[PDB]
Structures are given as structure tokens and as C-alpha cells.
């Protein structure tokens, strides 16, 4: 089997991407944030505290003839940005882009933190990291990809995120028309439950490439590119007037600037992030200070190749017995 679904930016900054997902019988379509940095499929629901729902579409398990309470199971998750959610668990039929999994754990939110309530465009998350990170207790549950893997033509999914435009998540096949050149594959460590790999270095603008190992995670659920402070300082030093602002919470730059590109290494290959992808716009409405899309990972404890980096590439999440990651230009 295969699936193919379009993923769409939630706003003009590409802060996140939503992909329609069919849950239950008859189908209830919710727009979920596909997150290769976590491993829970959770949704706003008829069980969510009413004051914490503000425009999201909800899953109502009582209206699904295939929903079944997973008795005794609860879940609770906290994300790197400080947000969180928790609730109970149903199993139900879940389809993405024509690919159907029966008996998928659908985690129904009873509580969500304010940032989820405040984002009316995201109806939940669909985790695509390794199932060892799934938070369901007392019986950990498998991700949608883990459940579908055996049925897929090939045990892979691909992320093709757009810059200010829709893109595609494919399951079970590699669309050879969606990228240029060849795909360079690189080793993955699953020891932390993430798609964790080691970049071979970086360049800033037209500068020379610096060979240096940068361990980090391919995380579609994180907006920005978080890298070591040395790397980030070298980047922003090329932008007149850029500075790290403790009050804003990272590097800012004059909105009048033209930003240089940023290149990262994948083995001997190179992925180029155009400068425009690094502009996240005014820090507050009408400000001439703009927020940077490359930020320091110091204090986060891990480097994160988030959407800023991934949307410059066609990315293969290879879930073979020994997982690997592939990157191609596009």
C-alpha cells in the first residue's frame, strides 16, 4: 500500500504545516501537525475541556462506529516549546492520503495548554518519531507509521515541505519526480527515540564549507533550525545589525536586511537553505526588528533540523530494520 497527502502551512510564516487525516467511521477529518520529533497521535476531542477549545475541529469518538476505548490507558506529553496536553485513549481507523490503519491509538485530549488552544488551525499532532517515545501508559502504543509499515510497498515515508506553499507527505514510496539529483543517505541513531543523525558541516552564504560534525534531529514539528552557538554566531555575523536579544528570546535582525543562505552537509552532499527561508518577520506587528530562523540550541540540549532546514530538501525517513535518513535537493 501507499498514501499521499498534501501538507499546508498554517500561516504566512510557515510556522507549522497541517495535513488532513481521516479518523473513525464515518470519517471525521482533522488537520494534524505531522511531527517527526514526537510519537503520539493526539487530537482535540469532545472530551477536551470546553474553555480550552477555540475553533479547532474535534474528534467525537461516540459518533464513530469503529472507536473503542482503550481501557485504563492515559497519556501526557510535554514538548520542547513548553506546551503540553493529556487525556485518554481510543483505538479507531485512521487514514492518511488513502493509506488506512485499523486499530490506531487515537489519544483524546482532556486538557491542552494555552498555545494549543490559541492556534485554531491545528486540531492535533501525528507523531512520526520512534514508538519508544510514545507516552501512553500503562501500555505504550505504536505510531501510525509503525502500524502501517508492514503493509507499505517500502518501509519509508517522505517529507517534502514547501516554502510559503503546500507540500507533500508520502508513505510507502519515493516519488522520483519530487527531487533533483540523487538522495544522499546518512546513518540514524534511534537511542533517544528521534531521527537523529550527524551533519558533516556548514557554510554561510558564499563562504567556504566548514567540516564539523553536528549531531541533531530531523524534526518536522519544530519551526526553526537550532544549531550550536558557534555556528549560529558565524551566520548572524554576516548580517549587519543582527544581534541576540535576551528580551525577545533569540537572534533578531533588521527587517531591511537581505539574508545570506545557509548550507548544511549530508555526507559529501550539500543542502542550501535560501536566505529568505531564514526570515520569520517582525517580532511584533509593525516592528522593523525581524526574528531569525536560525537560533542557538544552547540550553535545549540537542540540535534540531526543523522546518527551516527540512523544507529546503526532499527528506526520506527510511524505517527499514536499520533506519536511515535521506536528503535530496529539490
Swiss-Prot record:
It catalyses: Hydrolysis of proteins with specificity similar to that of pepsin A, prefers hydrophobic residues at P1 and P1', but does not cleave 14-Ala-|-Leu-15 in the B chain of insulin or Z-Glu-Tyr. Clots milk. GO terms for biological process: proteolysis. Its EC number is 3.4.23.22. Disulfide bonds join 255-290. It is an enzyme of class 3 (hydrolase). One of its GO terms (molecular function) is aspartic-type endopeptidase activity. The active site is at residues 35, 199. Residues 17-328 form the Peptidase A1 domain. Belongs to the peptidase A1 family. This is Endothiapepsin. The gene is EAPA.
